[PDB]
Ligand binder design. Structure first.
Ligand SMILES: Nc1nc2ccc(C[C@H](C(=O)O)c3ccc(C(=O)N[C@@H](CCC(=O)O)C(=O)O)cc3)cc2c(=O)[nH]1
Ligand SMILES: Nc1nc2ccc(C[C@H](C(=O)O)c3ccc(C(=O)N[C@@H](CCC(=O)O)C(=O)O)cc3)cc2c(=O)[nH]1
Ligand SMILES: NCC(=O)N[C@@H]1O[C@H](COP(=O)([O-])[O-])[C@@H](O)[C@H]1O
Ligand SMILES: NCC(=O)N[C@@H]1O[C@H](COP(=O)([O-])[O-])[C@@H](O)[C@H]1O
Lengths: 209, 209
């Protein structure tokens, strides 16, 4: 089972995934890590793990379509069974989403449908929500509109800073992402009729309950 | 629980609603029926049931805003708890949608998002669909774009005419519309964050599953 991970920054989720393959919780391997930022430390994590790395700079391309095309061309050298977005700060084109339909995953730092887009933690905190979390879902063209597979809620108390809750959510992300990937790896997770299904059963709008 | 129904034609769905109140499946009453067509037989259905009727001709108004305004003014004489569109062939203005936000329902003759608008049936046959149906949803300015509450699928077999399938879908409409209205009447159905919620639970893009 071949996994290709796409990142943009630190890659703590990438690390959790790497560790899960190592323990075999996930019966597969991370074949490659792609980044749109040369600096991403995640690349360094993959490097140290003997995993291949690649970098595609948006400037070197003259259109989003041209960029994803070279992305698809590159990612495919590894014959991935699933493409995983772990902190990938770049919106993917419909062509790309199409090419990996049903095998493209992402983990959004909020309790979807709440706060699609960037700056989740802040909104959650500035709006005064008593509950925050993360959501792993199948990627569709709709910015975080795809079928939610699993969420991990997290209590928000007075006094918690943006970083406090962020580190709290992160801890959950490291737990549910590798898990969702393992479900996928065992052919227990699929998507059709634009819905997420676990063990053959349809999952609710907010993921496995 | 006061219900005000809006129609344009025969009103078979109106009748199903009327019958449901009679049996108390819906714990409420149709207080009035409005139509934008003087001929609509639905008016006679209401008439025979001792229900009040009203007609608002578009020609008698010089703008859509003026028309809905008078419509709101009239509908409100009946202090409705919910306004139900049953075959109402007229697009309502934002102000109107706003005035009945969360308490405005419609039943579209197709499996939304598929075939928003008119000519559902014909497109289904034509586009050679193996499945057709109806969708009850909360009305938002987006033509059949609002939160779908419940759909009723219907199989399509070679040998089926546009009338064969239409009559098949109607039969379902008479079943799920009164049902959805009862959910609403029991305070079990609500809309917020532009989503449909049944028994406190968020409903999928396709309605109750
Ligand atoms: N089609 C599709 N592509 C996707 C590509 C990435 C992510 C991950 C993530 C999410 O899950 O949170 C996410 C990341 C970046 C932006 C964004 O708007 N970034 C730029 C704008 C344009 C771009 O460079 O792509 C920015 O610099 O602001 C939004 C969401 C999600 C999706 C998705 O759900 N659907
Ligand atoms: N704001 C709003 N109003 C609504 C009013 C009615 C219906 C129901 C229905 C649907 O669900 O089927 C529907 C009704 C009218 C047309 C329509 O195009 N009518 C005219 C155009 C403008 C007019 O009314 O003069 C036409 O003659 O083509 C299409 C579909 C849905 C909505 C809706 O979703 N949002
Ligand atoms: N563009 C996707 C996105 O929303 N990513 C989010 O950014 C953080 C980076 O974690 P990381 O250590 O896994 O890089 C994670 O919390 C992840 O959910
Ligand atoms: N513009 C709304 C719309 O498309 N309505 C549809 O028209 C038919 C009229 O039924 P009826 O008059 O016998 O209830 C119904 O099938 C309804 O879903």
């Amino acid at each position: 089972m071949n996994i290709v991970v796409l990142i943009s920054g630190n890659g703590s989720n990438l690390q959790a995934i790497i560790d899960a393959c190592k323990t075999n919780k996930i019966k597969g391997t991370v074949r490659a890590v792609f980044s749109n930022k040369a600096d991403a430390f995640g690349l360094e994590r993959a490097r140290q793990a003997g995993i291949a790395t690649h970098t595609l700079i948006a400037s070197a391309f003259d259109s989003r379509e041209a960029y994803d095309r070279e992305l698809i061309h590159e990612i495919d050298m590894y014959a991935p069974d699933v493409v995983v977005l772990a902190g990938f700060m770049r919106i993917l084109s419909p062509a790309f989403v199409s090419h990996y339909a049903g095998r493209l995953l992402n983990i959004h730092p909020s309790l979807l449908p709440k706060y699609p887009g960037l700056h989740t933690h802040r909104q959650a905190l500035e709006n005064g929500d008593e509950e925050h979390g993360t959501s792993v879902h199948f990627v569709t063209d709709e910015l975080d509109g795809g079928p939610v597979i699993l969420q991990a809620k997290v209590p928000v108390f007075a006094g918690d800073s943006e970083d406090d809750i962020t580190a709290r959510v992160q801890t959950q992300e490291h737990a549910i992402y590798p898990l969702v990937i393992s479900w996928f790896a065992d052919g227990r997770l699929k998507m059709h009729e634009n819905a997420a299904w676990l063990d053959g059963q349809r999952l609710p709008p907010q993921g496995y309950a």
